Design an enzyme around this catalytic site. Sequence first.
Site, short mmCIF file in Angstrom:
data_model
loop_
_atom_site.label_atom_id
_atom_site.label_comp_id
_atom_site.label_asym_id
_atom_site.label_seq_id
_atom_site.Cartn_x
_atom_site.Cartn_y
_atom_site.Cartn_z
CD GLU A 35 -3.08 -0.87 -0.14
OE1 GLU A 35 -2.95 0.10 -0.90
OE2 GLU A 35 -3.99 -1.73 -0.30
CG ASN A 46 -8.46 6.21 -5.07
OD1 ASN A 46 -7.43 5.55 -5.22
ND2 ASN A 46 -8.97 6.48 -3.86
CG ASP A 48 -13.49 7.23 -6.62
OD1 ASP A 48 -12.47 7.81 -6.21
OD2 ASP A 48 -14.11 6.42 -5.90
CB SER A 50 -12.03 8.83 -3.14
OG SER A 50 -11.55 7.65 -3.85
CG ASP A 52 -6.68 5.04 -1.64
OD1 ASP A 52 -7.91 5.21 -1.44
OD2 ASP A 52 -6.28 4.22 -2.44
CG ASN A 59 -11.05 5.31 -1.08
OD1 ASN A 59 -11.44 6.45 -1.18
ND2 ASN A 59 -11.03 4.48 -2.13
#
Length: 129
Positions: A35, A46, A48, A50, A52, A59
Site C-alpha cells: 500500500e 483515485n 473517482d 477520492s 487514499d 480511502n
Amino acid sequence: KVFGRCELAAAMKRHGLDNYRGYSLGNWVCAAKFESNFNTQATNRNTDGSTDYGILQINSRWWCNDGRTPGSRNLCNIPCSALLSSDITASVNCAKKIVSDGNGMNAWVAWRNRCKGTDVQAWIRGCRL
Ligand SMILES: [Cl-]
Ligand SMILES: [Cl-]
Ligand code: NA
C-alpha cells in the site's frame, strides 16, 4: 515517517492488529508494504476523485473526511490527515473498522493481489516481537 519492517510489525502488534479479525501480523505488514511502502505520509488519488491516505491507504470515499470527496462517508470519524501521522493510532483504529465490515482484508486490493495466500510470516521473520 517511513517505518522499518520490524519497527512497523512491532508497532502494529502494540496497537492490537496481531490476529485482529483472525489476520496474523504478517498480513498487516505485507499490506502496508504494498500500500504505502511503510510511509505514513503516502497519499494516492483515485480515478473517482477520492484519495487514499496513510500506511494502509484508507480511502476518503468511505472511511475519512478530506473535504474534497463529493458524496462520501466518514465511517471512521476522522479527518483523513489523521491517517498521515507518525503515530499509527488513527490508521490502526480505522483499519479495525474496515477489516470488520464483511470482506475482511479483501478491502485492501493490494493485500488481495499481493499478500493473500502467500507466506505472509516472512514479513515478520526475525523481528523482536
Ligand atoms: Cl468530502
Ligand atoms: Cl475474514
Ligand atoms: Na469522506
